[PDB]
Design a binder for this molecule. Sequence first.
Ligand SMILES: O=c1cc(-c2ccc(O)c(O)c2)oc2cc(O)cc(O)c12
Ligand SMILES: O=c1cc(-c2ccc(O)c(O)c2)oc2cc(O)cc(O)c12
Ligand SMILES: N[C@@H](CCC(=O)N[C@@H](CS)C(=O)NCC(=O)O)C(=O)O
Ligand SMILES: N[C@@H](CCC(=O)N[C@@H](CS)C(=O)NCC(=O)O)C(=O)O
Ligand SMILES: [Ca+2]
Ligand SMILES: [Ca+2]
Ligand SMILES: [Ca+2]
Ligand SMILES: [Ca+2]
Ligand SMILES: [Ca+2]
Ligand SMILES: [Ca+2]
Ligand SMILES: [Ca+2]
Ligand SMILES: [Ca+2]
Lengths: 217, 217
Amino acid sequence: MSKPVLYYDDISPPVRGVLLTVAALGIKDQVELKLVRLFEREHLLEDFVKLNPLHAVPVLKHDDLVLTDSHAIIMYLCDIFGQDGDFSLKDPKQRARVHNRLCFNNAVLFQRESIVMRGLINRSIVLEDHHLKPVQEAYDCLEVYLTNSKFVACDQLTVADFPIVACMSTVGMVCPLSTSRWPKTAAWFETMKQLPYYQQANQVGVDKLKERLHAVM
Amino acid sequence: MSKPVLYYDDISPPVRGVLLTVAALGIKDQVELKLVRLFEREHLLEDFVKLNPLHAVPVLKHDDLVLTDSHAIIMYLCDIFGQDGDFSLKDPKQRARVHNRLCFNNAVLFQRESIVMRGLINRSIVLEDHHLKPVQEAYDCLEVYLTNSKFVACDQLTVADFPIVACMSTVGMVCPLSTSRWPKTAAWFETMKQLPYYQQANQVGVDKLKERLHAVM
Ligand SMILES: O=c1cc(-c2ccc(O)c(O)c2)oc2cc(O)cc(O)c12
Ligand SMILES: O=c1cc(-c2ccc(O)c(O)c2)oc2cc(O)cc(O)c12
Ligand SMILES: N[C@@H](CCC(=O)N[C@@H](CS)C(=O)NCC(=O)O)C(=O)O
Ligand SMILES: N[C@@H](CCC(=O)N[C@@H](CS)C(=O)NCC(=O)O)C(=O)O
Ligand SMILES: [Ca+2]
Ligand SMILES: [Ca+2]
Ligand SMILES: [Ca+2]
Ligand SMILES: [Ca+2]
Ligand SMILES: [Ca+2]
Ligand SMILES: [Ca+2]
Ligand SMILES: [Ca+2]
Ligand SMILES: [Ca+2]
Protein backbone atom coordinates (compact mmCIF):
# COMPACT_ATOMS: atom_id res chain seq x y z
CA MET A 1 0.00 0.00 0.00
CA SER A 2 3.14 2.14 -0.16
CA LYS A 3 3.67 3.85 -3.53
CA PRO A 4 7.19 4.75 -4.70
CA VAL A 5 7.63 8.45 -5.50
CA LEU A 6 9.71 9.35 -8.58
CA TYR A 7 11.36 12.80 -8.46
CA TYR A 8 11.78 13.73 -12.09
CA ASP A 9 12.23 16.13 -15.00
CA ASP A 10 11.58 14.49 -18.36
CA ILE A 11 14.12 16.59 -20.27
CA SER A 12 16.68 14.26 -18.62
CA PRO A 13 17.59 11.01 -20.45
CA PRO A 14 18.12 9.19 -17.10
CA VAL A 15 14.59 10.24 -16.10
CA ARG A 16 13.11 9.12 -19.41
CA GLY A 17 14.77 5.71 -19.02
CA VAL A 18 12.70 5.34 -15.86
CA LEU A 19 9.51 6.72 -17.41
CA LEU A 20 9.84 4.23 -20.28
CA THR A 21 10.38 1.44 -17.72
CA VAL A 22 7.35 2.47 -15.66
CA ALA A 23 5.13 2.42 -18.75
CA ALA A 24 6.60 -0.84 -20.05
CA LEU A 25 6.02 -2.59 -16.70
CA GLY A 26 2.42 -1.30 -16.66
CA ILE A 27 2.88 0.48 -13.33
CA LYS A 28 2.07 4.12 -14.10
CA ASP A 29 -0.72 3.99 -11.51
CA GLN A 30 1.61 2.56 -8.85
CA VAL A 31 4.42 5.16 -9.06
CA GLU A 32 3.67 8.71 -7.97
CA LEU A 33 5.51 11.50 -9.75
CA LYS A 34 6.97 14.62 -8.19
CA LEU A 35 8.26 17.23 -10.60
CA VAL A 36 11.71 18.68 -9.88
CA ARG A 37 12.35 21.19 -12.66
CA LEU A 38 16.04 21.56 -13.59
CA PHE A 39 15.69 24.82 -15.54
CA GLU A 40 14.08 26.48 -12.55
CA ARG A 41 16.74 25.06 -10.20
CA GLU A 42 14.33 23.05 -8.03
CA HIS A 43 17.05 20.39 -7.73
CA LEU A 44 19.10 22.83 -5.64
CA LEU A 45 16.43 23.39 -2.97
CA GLU A 46 17.46 22.36 0.54
CA ASP A 47 14.88 19.54 0.81
CA PHE A 48 15.99 17.96 -2.45
CA VAL A 49 19.72 18.28 -1.67
CA LYS A 50 19.05 16.58 1.67
CA LEU A 51 17.26 13.79 -0.21
CA ASN A 52 20.06 13.49 -2.81
CA PRO A 53 23.44 15.23 -2.26
CA LEU A 54 24.16 14.71 -5.97
CA HIS A 55 21.30 17.21 -6.58
CA ALA A 56 20.23 15.30 -9.67
CA VAL A 57 17.16 13.57 -11.10
CA PRO A 58 15.77 10.94 -11.05
CA VAL A 59 15.35 9.97 -7.40
CA LEU A 60 13.02 7.23 -6.14
CA LYS A 61 11.73 7.21 -2.58
CA HIS A 62 10.00 4.06 -1.37
CA ASP A 63 9.34 4.14 2.36
CA ASP A 64 12.81 4.80 3.80
CA LEU A 65 14.65 3.62 0.67
CA VAL A 66 16.15 6.46 -1.39
CA LEU A 67 17.60 5.53 -4.79
CA THR A 68 19.64 8.22 -6.55
CA ASP A 69 20.50 6.67 -9.90
CA SER A 70 18.10 5.85 -12.72
CA HIS A 71 19.74 2.48 -13.32
CA ALA A 72 19.26 1.41 -9.69
CA ILE A 73 15.68 2.72 -9.82
CA ILE A 74 14.99 0.61 -12.92
CA MET A 75 16.33 -2.65 -11.46
CA TYR A 76 14.46 -2.09 -8.19
CA LEU A 77 11.16 -1.46 -9.99
CA CYS A 78 11.78 -4.67 -11.92
CA ASP A 79 12.34 -6.59 -8.69
CA ILE A 80 9.19 -5.44 -6.91
CA PHE A 81 6.76 -5.05 -9.85
CA GLY A 82 8.06 -7.24 -12.68
CA GLN A 83 9.13 -10.59 -11.21
CA ASP A 84 6.51 -12.69 -13.06
CA GLY A 85 6.33 -10.79 -16.36
CA ASP A 86 8.12 -10.24 -19.68
CA PHE A 87 10.76 -8.00 -18.03
CA SER A 88 11.63 -10.33 -15.14
CA LEU A 89 15.16 -10.37 -13.72
CA LYS A 90 14.69 -13.49 -11.57
CA ASP A 91 17.31 -15.52 -13.44
CA PRO A 92 20.87 -14.64 -12.33
CA LYS A 93 22.50 -14.66 -15.77
CA GLN A 94 19.61 -12.69 -17.28
CA ARG A 95 19.87 -10.15 -14.46
CA ALA A 96 23.62 -9.84 -15.13
CA ARG A 97 23.11 -9.44 -18.91
CA VAL A 98 20.64 -6.62 -18.29
CA HIS A 99 22.75 -5.03 -15.54
CA ASN A 100 25.79 -5.17 -17.84
CA ARG A 101 24.01 -3.02 -20.44
CA LEU A 102 22.66 -0.64 -17.78
CA CYS A 103 26.30 -0.12 -16.75
CA PHE A 104 27.19 0.53 -20.39
CA ASN A 105 24.57 3.26 -20.51
CA ASN A 106 25.47 4.82 -17.17
CA ALA A 107 29.26 4.66 -17.51
CA VAL A 108 29.76 5.02 -21.29
CA LEU A 109 26.87 6.26 -23.44
CA PHE A 110 25.28 8.68 -20.95
CA GLN A 111 28.67 9.97 -19.79
CA ARG A 112 29.76 10.81 -23.33
CA GLU A 113 26.54 12.36 -24.50
CA SER A 114 25.98 14.44 -21.35
CA ILE A 115 29.42 16.02 -21.80
CA VAL A 116 28.33 17.24 -25.23
CA MET A 117 24.78 18.26 -24.28
CA ARG A 118 25.64 19.97 -20.96
CA GLY A 119 28.40 21.88 -22.73
CA LEU A 120 25.94 23.14 -25.36
CA ILE A 121 23.29 24.13 -22.73
CA ASN A 122 25.88 25.93 -20.50
CA ARG A 123 27.54 27.39 -23.69
CA SER A 124 31.03 25.94 -22.89
CA ILE A 125 31.09 24.58 -26.50
CA VAL A 126 29.73 26.20 -29.72
CA LEU A 127 30.70 20.84 -32.76
CA GLU A 128 34.10 19.77 -34.00
CA ASP A 129 34.53 16.11 -34.92
CA HIS A 130 36.62 15.81 -31.74
CA HIS A 131 33.50 16.21 -29.58
CA LEU A 132 31.49 13.44 -31.26
CA LYS A 133 34.20 10.77 -31.60
CA PRO A 134 33.49 9.27 -28.13
CA VAL A 135 29.76 9.12 -28.93
CA GLN A 136 30.48 7.44 -32.26
CA GLU A 137 32.70 4.90 -30.48
CA ALA A 138 29.76 4.15 -28.17
CA TYR A 139 27.57 3.69 -31.26
CA ASP A 140 30.16 1.21 -32.54
CA CYS A 141 29.82 -0.83 -29.35
CA LEU A 142 26.03 -0.68 -29.45
CA GLU A 143 26.16 -1.90 -33.06
CA VAL A 144 28.16 -4.96 -31.93
CA TYR A 145 25.65 -5.70 -29.16
CA LEU A 146 22.74 -5.47 -31.60
CA THR A 147 24.54 -7.71 -34.07
CA ASN A 148 24.78 -10.46 -31.44
CA SER A 149 21.24 -10.09 -30.08
CA LYS A 150 18.03 -8.55 -31.34
CA PHE A 151 17.76 -6.06 -28.44
CA VAL A 152 20.60 -4.59 -26.41
CA ALA A 153 20.92 -7.35 -23.76
CA CYS A 154 19.40 -10.44 -25.41
CA ASP A 155 16.87 -11.39 -28.06
CA GLN A 156 13.95 -9.94 -26.08
CA LEU A 157 13.21 -6.37 -25.12
CA THR A 158 14.45 -5.73 -21.56
CA VAL A 159 14.62 -2.74 -19.26
CA ALA A 160 18.18 -2.13 -20.49
CA ASP A 161 16.83 -0.94 -23.86
CA PHE A 162 15.11 2.04 -22.19
CA PRO A 163 18.01 4.07 -20.71
CA ILE A 164 19.93 3.50 -23.93
CA VAL A 165 17.11 4.67 -26.19
CA ALA A 166 16.55 7.68 -23.92
CA CYS A 167 20.18 8.68 -24.50
CA MET A 168 20.16 7.75 -28.20
CA SER A 169 17.13 9.95 -28.83
CA THR A 170 18.92 12.85 -27.10
CA VAL A 171 22.43 12.78 -28.50
CA GLY A 172 20.95 11.88 -31.89
CA MET A 173 19.97 15.54 -32.25
CA VAL A 174 23.68 16.44 -32.61
CA CYS A 175 25.21 13.06 -33.63
CA PRO A 176 22.61 11.34 -35.81
CA LEU A 177 22.74 7.65 -36.61
CA SER A 178 23.84 6.72 -40.11
CA THR A 179 21.83 3.73 -41.33
CA SER A 180 24.68 2.71 -43.62
CA ARG A 181 27.23 2.91 -40.78
CA TRP A 182 25.16 1.52 -37.87
CA PRO A 183 22.38 -0.47 -39.58
CA LYS A 184 21.48 -2.73 -36.65
CA THR A 185 21.33 0.25 -34.28
CA ALA A 186 19.25 2.34 -36.69
CA ALA A 187 16.74 -0.49 -37.11
CA TRP A 188 16.61 -1.09 -33.35
CA PHE A 189 16.06 2.65 -32.81
CA GLU A 190 13.17 2.73 -35.28
CA THR A 191 11.69 -0.30 -33.54
CA MET A 192 11.82 1.34 -30.13
CA LYS A 193 10.16 4.50 -31.48
CA GLN A 194 7.15 2.29 -32.38
CA LEU A 195 6.52 1.19 -28.80
CA PRO A 196 3.08 2.52 -27.75
CA TYR A 197 4.42 4.37 -24.69
CA TYR A 198 7.43 5.92 -26.47
CA GLN A 199 5.71 9.20 -27.37
CA GLN A 200 4.49 10.06 -23.86
CA ALA A 201 7.40 8.63 -21.88
CA ASN A 202 10.29 9.79 -24.07
CA GLN A 203 9.37 11.97 -27.04
CA VAL A 204 7.71 14.72 -24.98
CA GLY A 205 10.92 15.32 -23.04
CA VAL A 206 13.06 15.02 -26.16
CA ASP A 207 10.95 17.75 -27.79
CA LYS A 208 11.41 20.06 -24.79
CA LEU A 209 15.18 19.60 -24.95
CA LYS A 210 15.22 20.21 -28.71
CA GLU A 211 13.57 23.58 -28.08
CA ARG A 212 16.18 24.50 -25.47
CA LEU A 213 18.94 23.45 -27.89
CA HIS A 214 17.52 25.66 -30.63
CA ALA A 215 17.28 28.58 -28.18
CA VAL A 216 20.97 28.23 -27.25
CA MET A 217 21.99 27.89 -30.91
CA MET B 1 32.15 -27.15 -12.30
CA SER B 2 32.47 -24.09 -14.54
CA LYS B 3 34.86 -21.44 -13.19
CA PRO B 4 34.39 -17.77 -14.13
CA VAL B 5 37.46 -16.21 -15.76
CA LEU B 6 38.37 -12.64 -14.74
CA TYR B 7 40.35 -10.67 -17.36
CA TYR B 8 42.24 -8.12 -15.34
CA ASP B 9 45.05 -5.64 -14.69
CA ASP B 10 45.28 -4.64 -11.04
CA ILE B 11 46.51 -1.10 -11.73
CA SER B 12 42.83 -0.43 -12.62
CA PRO B 13 40.48 0.65 -9.79
CA PRO B 14 37.52 -1.16 -11.45
CA VAL B 15 39.63 -4.34 -11.47
CA ARG B 16 40.64 -3.92 -7.83
CA GLY B 17 36.99 -3.50 -6.85
CA VAL B 18 36.47 -7.00 -8.22
CA LEU B 19 39.63 -8.42 -6.64
CA LEU B 20 38.53 -7.07 -3.25
CA THR B 21 35.09 -8.63 -3.80
CA VAL B 22 36.56 -12.01 -4.78
CA ALA B 23 38.69 -12.09 -1.62
CA ALA B 24 35.87 -10.85 0.61
CA LEU B 25 33.49 -13.54 -0.69
CA GLY B 26 36.18 -16.19 -0.11
CA ILE B 27 36.16 -17.31 -3.74
CA LYS B 28 39.75 -16.79 -4.89
CA ASP B 29 39.97 -20.50 -5.70
CA GLN B 30 36.76 -20.39 -7.75
CA VAL B 31 37.62 -17.49 -10.09
CA GLU B 32 40.42 -17.97 -12.60
CA LEU B 33 42.48 -14.93 -13.51
CA LYS B 34 43.74 -13.98 -16.95
CA LEU B 35 46.14 -11.06 -17.09
CA VAL B 36 45.44 -8.39 -19.72
CA ARG B 37 48.20 -5.81 -19.29
CA LEU B 38 47.14 -2.25 -20.17
CA PHE B 39 50.65 -0.78 -20.41
CA GLU B 40 51.62 -3.39 -22.96
CA ARG B 41 48.37 -2.85 -24.90
CA GLU B 42 47.06 -6.41 -24.50
CA HIS B 43 43.55 -4.94 -24.25
CA LEU B 44 43.79 -3.95 -27.92
CA LEU B 45 44.48 -7.47 -29.23
CA GLU B 46 41.87 -8.81 -31.64
CA ASP B 47 40.69 -11.61 -29.31
CA PHE B 48 40.11 -9.23 -26.42
CA VAL B 49 38.36 -6.60 -28.57
CA LYS B 50 36.06 -9.35 -29.86
CA LEU B 51 35.34 -10.31 -26.24
CA ASN B 52 34.77 -6.67 -25.18
CA PRO B 53 34.40 -3.90 -27.81
CA LEU B 54 35.03 -1.36 -25.04
CA HIS B 55 38.60 -2.81 -24.92
CA ALA B 56 38.70 -2.35 -21.15
CA VAL B 57 39.26 -4.37 -17.99
CA PRO B 58 37.77 -6.06 -16.05
CA VAL B 59 35.82 -8.63 -18.06
CA LEU B 60 34.23 -11.77 -16.61
CA LYS B 61 33.48 -14.79 -18.77
CA HIS B 62 31.30 -17.51 -17.26
CA ASP B 63 30.28 -20.10 -19.83
CA ASP B 64 28.67 -17.97 -22.56
CA LEU B 65 28.04 -14.99 -20.26
CA VAL B 66 30.39 -12.06 -20.87
CA LEU B 67 30.24 -9.18 -18.37
CA THR B 68 32.12 -6.01 -19.32
CA ASP B 69 31.72 -3.76 -16.28
CA SER B 70 33.22 -4.30 -12.84
CA HIS B 71 29.96 -3.34 -11.13
CA ALA B 72 27.97 -5.96 -13.05
CA ILE B 73 30.74 -8.50 -12.35
CA ILE B 74 30.51 -7.76 -8.62
CA MET B 75 26.72 -8.17 -8.38
CA TYR B 76 26.82 -11.38 -10.43
CA LEU B 77 29.52 -12.91 -8.21
CA CYS B 78 27.37 -11.99 -5.22
CA ASP B 79 24.37 -13.73 -6.76
CA ILE B 80 26.09 -17.02 -7.56
CA PHE B 81 28.62 -17.26 -4.69
CA GLY B 82 27.30 -15.09 -1.84
CA GLN B 83 23.57 -15.74 -1.47
CA ASP B 84 23.77 -17.25 2.04
CA GLY B 85 26.61 -15.16 3.50
CA ASP B 86 27.47 -11.76 4.99
CA PHE B 87 27.43 -10.10 1.55
CA SER B 88 24.08 -11.48 0.38
CA LEU B 89 21.89 -9.44 -1.98
CA LYS B 90 18.79 -11.65 -1.66
CA ASP B 91 16.65 -8.92 -0.12
CA PRO B 92 15.29 -6.49 -2.76
CA LYS B 93 15.81 -3.27 -0.79
CA GLN B 94 19.29 -4.35 0.31
CA ARG B 95 20.17 -5.18 -3.30
CA ALA B 96 18.93 -1.74 -4.37
CA ARG B 97 20.89 0.04 -1.59
CA VAL B 98 24.07 -1.71 -2.71
CA HIS B 99 23.35 -1.21 -6.42
CA ASN B 100 22.69 2.48 -5.76
CA ARG B 101 26.21 2.94 -4.36
CA LEU B 102 27.76 0.86 -7.16
CA CYS B 103 26.11 3.31 -9.57
CA PHE B 104 27.58 6.20 -7.56
CA ASN B 105 31.03 4.71 -8.01
CA ASN B 106 30.63 3.90 -11.70
CA ALA B 107 28.88 7.11 -12.77
CA VAL B 108 30.34 9.69 -10.34
CA LEU B 109 33.48 8.81 -8.37
CA PHE B 110 35.23 6.65 -10.97
CA GLN B 111 34.27 8.99 -13.81
CA ARG B 112 35.76 12.01 -12.06
CA GLU B 113 38.93 10.39 -10.85
CA SER B 114 39.70 8.61 -14.14
CA ILE B 115 39.54 11.95 -15.97
CA VAL B 116 42.30 13.24 -13.70
CA MET B 117 44.41 10.06 -13.65
CA ARG B 118 44.16 9.25 -17.38
CA GLY B 119 45.07 12.85 -18.15
CA LEU B 120 48.21 12.60 -15.99
CA ILE B 121 49.24 9.21 -17.51
CA ASN B 122 48.67 10.42 -21.13
CA ARG B 123 50.27 13.83 -20.19
CA SER B 124 47.19 15.90 -21.28
CA ILE B 125 47.40 17.67 -17.86
CA VAL B 126 50.54 18.71 -15.87
CA LEU B 127 46.90 20.07 -10.98
CA GLU B 128 44.93 23.28 -10.73
CA ASP B 129 42.13 23.39 -8.17
CA HIS B 130 39.74 23.24 -11.14
CA HIS B 131 40.70 19.61 -11.81
CA LEU B 132 40.02 18.36 -8.27
CA LYS B 133 36.75 20.18 -7.54
CA PRO B 134 34.58 17.37 -9.02
CA VAL B 135 36.48 14.78 -6.96
CA GLN B 136 36.03 16.87 -3.81
CA GLU B 137 32.30 17.14 -4.55
CA ALA B 138 32.20 13.34 -4.76
CA TYR B 139 33.99 13.20 -1.39
CA ASP B 140 31.27 15.49 -0.01
CA CYS B 141 28.60 13.02 -1.13
CA LEU B 142 30.51 10.06 0.27
CA GLU B 143 30.81 11.93 3.59
CA VAL B 144 27.00 12.27 3.71
CA TYR B 145 26.54 8.56 3.00
CA LEU B 146 28.98 7.62 5.77
CA THR B 147 27.26 9.98 8.18
CA ASN B 148 23.96 8.16 7.67
CA SER B 149 25.39 4.62 7.76
CA LYS B 150 28.58 3.05 9.04
CA PHE B 151 29.63 1.74 5.59
CA VAL B 152 28.74 3.19 2.21
CA ALA B 153 25.39 1.41 1.66
CA CYS B 154 24.22 0.48 5.17
CA ASP B 155 25.61 -0.28 8.61
CA GLN B 156 27.39 -3.44 7.42
CA LEU B 157 30.25 -3.84 4.99
CA THR B 158 28.87 -4.69 1.53
CA VAL B 159 30.34 -5.22 -1.90
CA ALA B 160 29.64 -1.54 -2.65
CA ASP B 161 32.48 -0.52 -0.31
CA PHE B 162 35.05 -2.22 -2.57
CA PRO B 163 34.79 -0.29 -5.88
CA ILE B 164 34.64 2.93 -3.89
CA VAL B 165 37.73 2.16 -1.81
CA ALA B 166 39.57 1.06 -4.96
CA CYS B 167 38.91 4.52 -6.44
CA MET B 168 39.55 6.37 -3.17
CA SER B 169 42.95 4.74 -2.79
CA THR B 170 43.82 5.81 -6.36
CA VAL B 171 42.66 9.40 -6.59
CA GLY B 172 43.88 9.91 -3.01
CA MET B 173 47.41 10.07 -4.42
CA VAL B 174 46.55 13.44 -6.04
CA CYS B 175 43.51 14.54 -3.97
CA PRO B 176 44.13 13.32 -0.42
CA LEU B 177 41.40 13.11 2.18
CA SER B 178 41.44 15.74 4.89
CA THR B 179 40.42 14.20 8.21
CA SER B 180 39.13 17.56 9.42
CA ARG B 181 37.06 18.07 6.25
CA TRP B 182 35.81 14.49 5.63
CA PRO B 183 36.13 12.80 9.04
CA LYS B 184 33.64 9.99 8.45
CA THR B 185 35.22 9.16 5.09
CA ALA B 186 38.77 9.26 6.49
CA ALA B 187 37.81 6.88 9.31
CA TRP B 188 35.99 4.57 6.90
CA PHE B 189 39.05 4.59 4.62
CA GLU B 190 41.37 3.66 7.49
CA THR B 191 38.97 0.87 8.43
CA MET B 192 38.96 -0.58 4.94
CA LYS B 193 42.78 -0.53 4.80
CA GLN B 194 42.72 -2.90 7.81
CA LEU B 195 40.80 -5.63 6.00
CA PRO B 196 43.07 -8.71 5.77
CA TYR B 197 42.80 -8.95 1.96
CA TYR B 198 43.32 -5.22 1.30
CA GLN B 199 47.08 -5.43 0.79
CA GLN B 200 47.04 -8.19 -1.85
CA ALA B 201 43.80 -7.24 -3.60
CA ASN B 202 44.21 -3.45 -3.70
CA GLN B 203 47.50 -2.10 -2.36
CA VAL B 204 49.72 -4.02 -4.81
CA GLY B 205 47.99 -2.39 -7.78
CA VAL B 206 47.93 1.02 -6.09
CA ASP B 207 51.70 0.78 -5.61
CA LYS B 208 52.23 -0.05 -9.30
CA LEU B 209 50.18 2.98 -10.32
CA LYS B 210 52.05 5.23 -7.88
CA GLU B 211 55.29 4.24 -9.62
CA ARG B 212 53.86 5.08 -13.03
CA LEU B 213 52.63 8.43 -11.68
CA HIS B 214 56.09 9.27 -10.34
CA ALA B 215 57.64 8.31 -13.70
CA VAL B 216 55.31 10.70 -15.57
CA MET B 217 55.92 13.48 -13.04
O1 LIG C 1 23.09 19.17 -15.13
C1 LIG C 1 22.25 19.36 -15.95
C2 LIG C 1 22.07 18.42 -17.02
C3 LIG C 1 21.02 18.66 -18.04
C4 LIG C 1 20.86 17.67 -19.18
C5 LIG C 1 19.77 17.76 -20.03
C6 LIG C 1 19.65 16.86 -21.08
C7 LIG C 1 20.64 15.91 -21.26
O2 LIG C 1 20.55 14.99 -22.31
C8 LIG C 1 21.72 15.83 -20.41
O3 LIG C 1 22.70 14.85 -20.62
C9 LIG C 1 21.84 16.73 -19.37
O4 LIG C 1 20.19 19.82 -17.98
C10 LIG C 1 20.38 20.81 -16.87
C11 LIG C 1 19.56 21.93 -16.82
C12 LIG C 1 19.72 22.86 -15.79
O5 LIG C 1 18.90 23.99 -15.75
C13 LIG C 1 20.70 22.65 -14.81
C14 LIG C 1 21.52 21.52 -14.85
O6 LIG C 1 22.50 21.34 -13.87
C15 LIG C 1 21.37 20.59 -15.88
O1 LIG D 1 42.52 3.79 -20.32
C1 LIG D 1 43.37 3.61 -19.51
C2 LIG D 1 43.09 3.88 -18.11
C3 LIG D 1 44.15 3.64 -17.10
C4 LIG D 1 43.86 3.94 -15.65
C5 LIG D 1 44.75 3.56 -14.66
C6 LIG D 1 44.47 3.86 -13.34
C7 LIG D 1 43.31 4.56 -13.04
O2 LIG D 1 43.00 4.89 -11.72
C8 LIG D 1 42.43 4.95 -14.03
O3 LIG D 1 41.27 5.65 -13.69
C9 LIG D 1 42.71 4.65 -15.35
O4 LIG D 1 45.45 3.19 -17.49
C10 LIG D 1 45.74 2.92 -18.93
C11 LIG D 1 47.01 2.46 -19.29
C12 LIG D 1 47.29 2.21 -20.63
O5 LIG D 1 48.57 1.76 -20.99
C13 LIG D 1 46.31 2.41 -21.61
C14 LIG D 1 45.04 2.86 -21.25
O6 LIG D 1 44.07 3.06 -22.24
C15 LIG D 1 44.75 3.12 -19.91
N1 LIG E 1 23.82 8.42 -13.33
C1 LIG E 1 22.67 9.30 -12.94
C2 LIG E 1 22.76 10.63 -13.68
C3 LIG E 1 21.72 11.65 -13.22
C4 LIG E 1 21.98 13.03 -13.79
O1 LIG E 1 23.12 13.41 -14.07
N2 LIG E 1 20.92 13.81 -13.97
C5 LIG E 1 21.03 15.17 -14.46
C6 LIG E 1 20.08 15.43 -15.61
S1 LIG E 1 20.43 14.38 -17.04
C7 LIG E 1 20.79 16.22 -13.39
O2 LIG E 1 19.77 16.14 -12.70
N3 LIG E 1 21.72 17.17 -13.27
C8 LIG E 1 21.59 18.27 -12.33
C9 LIG E 1 22.93 18.63 -11.69
O3 LIG E 1 23.90 17.91 -11.97
O4 LIG E 1 22.95 19.63 -10.93
C10 LIG E 1 21.37 8.57 -13.29
O5 LIG E 1 21.39 7.81 -14.26
O6 LIG E 1 20.38 8.79 -12.56
N1 LIG F 1 32.86 1.17 -15.94
C1 LIG F 1 33.96 0.21 -16.29
C2 LIG F 1 35.27 0.97 -16.52
C3 LIG F 1 36.39 0.08 -17.04
C4 LIG F 1 37.59 0.90 -17.49
O1 LIG F 1 37.48 2.04 -17.91
N2 LIG F 1 38.78 0.30 -17.39
C5 LIG F 1 40.01 0.94 -17.83
C6 LIG F 1 41.08 0.87 -16.76
S1 LIG F 1 40.61 1.73 -15.24
C7 LIG F 1 40.57 0.36 -19.12
O2 LIG F 1 40.72 -0.86 -19.20
N3 LIG F 1 40.85 1.24 -20.08
C8 LIG F 1 41.45 0.84 -21.34
C9 LIG F 1 40.89 1.64 -22.52
O3 LIG F 1 39.95 2.43 -22.27
O4 LIG F 1 41.39 1.44 -23.65
C10 LIG F 1 34.10 -0.80 -15.15
O5 LIG F 1 33.84 -0.39 -14.01
O6 LIG F 1 34.47 -1.95 -15.44
CA1 LIG G 1 -1.65 10.50 -9.26
CA1 LIG H 1 7.81 28.12 -13.20
CA1 LIG I 1 10.72 20.29 4.05
CA1 LIG J 1 13.82 21.90 4.65
CA1 LIG K 1 44.80 -21.17 -10.65
CA1 LIG L 1 56.07 -7.74 -21.06
CA1 LIG M 1 42.01 -16.61 -30.59
CA1 LIG N 1 41.65 -14.12 -33.09
